[PDB]
Design a protein around this nucleic acid. Structure first.
Ligand SMILES: Nc1ncnc2c1ncn2[C@@H]1O[C@@H]2COP(=O)(O)O[C@H]2[C@H]1O
Ligand SMILES: Nc1ncnc2c1ncn2[C@@H]1O[C@@H]2COP(=O)(O)O[C@H]2[C@H]1O
Ligand SMILES: Nc1ncnc2c1ncn2[C@@H]1O[C@@H]2COP(=O)(O)O[C@H]2[C@H]1O
Lengths: 225, 225
DNA sequence: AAATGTGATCTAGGTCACGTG
DNA sequence: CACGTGACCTAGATCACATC
């Protein structure tokens, strides 16, 4: 049902899924509207959430007031755990793109599950490990890849994660306004659209509201390169 | 000498200082010249290193032949662990700007220490956590702060770490060529020099060889923000 | 009816070219 | 082989609209 998702939460991953099943239960869920601010920077938190449905964007804002988005999280993705490992104010903020079902847990609860099963620590370090990896890849493309090739690279990220295969090519219902993709890519609203214009101009992809159909993933991949 | 550092080291805040003195002992040191590629991208690794002296620079290169530097590490700084927690090729290369004395340790060796002492896993997660946090700050500044602002930010991030207190102001012997600062900042060699020019021009800092005597940290800071 | 398209400018900064100790 | 500092020249933000 929904332990189907949590099973793929990293932290469980492996770990006596018979355990997982009993544990979910202590855990109780929370529901959020589209656009709810789960938490914001500066505000202190000792609570981490695993997403069950919907999508959450992580972000930051400079004092000038411009935001960028770190990442898009979706089912089975867990977030807001840095202030669980390094206690302190949130460094970012979590808002909703959709209706979200999320399970929530605090720090004192976590150390319990970690105390009972070591292997979870193994797997958290693996998540963080992978996670920083993913982030260095980005900090790199900010430096090298141009706004176009980046938009192209993003579409791939999203497609893979949130993708589905319908007919002969895959579907991506990103649920992002282009404004969001822009700040998820570090660029201006407009200059990304044009990247997309051309992207669709070559018949590489089809734009359909908050989603996209992608015809030539080979060409798109090639271009982001 | 060798041991004063380890306590200041990361894996093991605390800890059981009784342990550190002995465990430090099994680890065998190894030395490297100024410019030794400890490891490079693609090549496998199961070994993480704590620096005991000198400085190593992490960074990447595109197929184009450009390259950027993720970070500069010094004494008591761990690196090369990501392929320990998240097994897989190196995502970066570690090179020396110095003569570096570093202690080395593999994955299996690490699981031992973890299995004996748990706290270590809490402390590793704290490290990574702090790291992703500091990385994000950087991804942000690529996006928003201008090259001059970043160079002035970096100079601080160096002082804070490899800095000392000479007379009334602080000395930083970065041991970096400007080309390196550039790529540590994600800008060209030249546009970084002139940034420095103006910085020193305003008497904010004095440049001598591979170091810098900072006069007005208040100005530089404001300036970088 | 806020989300989009798309052009007409402006500018930071990259690329060159070439100096210097 | 590290710095210095110019004289251009592309990428892209900014603004200015117009369409759903
Ligand atoms: N660059 C990033 N990539 C992925 N997740 C992040 C990133 N930055 C912050 N987060 C998550 O967002 C959370 C914000 O609050 P925390 O600091 O408690 O924990 C943070 C992480 O779980
Ligand atoms: N790995 C990196 N490669 C290139 N530039 C970086 C890197 N990390 C940080 N920077 C930039 O250099 C700036 C120095 O100051 P900050 O770290 O606060 O903000 C930093 C980023 O804008
Ligand atoms: N953003 C970063 N800042 C500082 N050090 C890093 C960063 N990213 C990776 N590293 C270190 O560089 C190492 C490269 O090899 P590993 O991936 O095995 O482990 C990595 C980390 O220890």
């Amino acid at each position: 049902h929904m332990d189907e998702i949590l099973a793929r939460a990293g932290i469980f991953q492996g770990v006596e899924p018979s355990a997982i099943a009993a544990l979910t239960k202590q855990l109780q869920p929370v529901d959020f509207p589209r656009g709810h601010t789960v938490f914001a920077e500066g505000e202190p938190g000792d609570r981490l959430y695993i997403i069950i449905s919907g999508k959450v964007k992580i972000g930051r804002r400079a004092p000038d007031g411009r935001e960028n988005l770190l990442t898009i999280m979706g089912p089975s993705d867990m977030f807001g755990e840095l202030s669980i490992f390094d206690p302190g104010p949130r460094t970012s903020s979590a808002t909703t793109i959709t209706e979200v079902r999320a399970v929530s847990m605090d720090r004192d609860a976590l150390r319990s599950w970690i105390a009972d099963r070591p292997e979870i620590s193994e797997q958290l370090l693996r998540v963080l490990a992978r996670r920083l990896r993913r982030t260095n890849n980005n900090l790199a493309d900010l430096i090298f890849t141009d706004v176009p090739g980046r938009v192209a690279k993003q579409l791939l990220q999203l497609a893979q994660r949130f993708g589905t295969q319908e007919g002969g090519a895959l579907r991506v219902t990103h649920d992002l306004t282009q404004e969001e993709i822009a700040q998820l890519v570090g660029a201006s609203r407009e200059t990304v659209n044009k990247a997309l214009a051309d992207f669709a101009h070559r018949g590489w992809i089809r734009l359909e509201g908050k989603s996209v159909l992608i015809s030539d993933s080979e060409r798109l991949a090639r271009r982001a390169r």
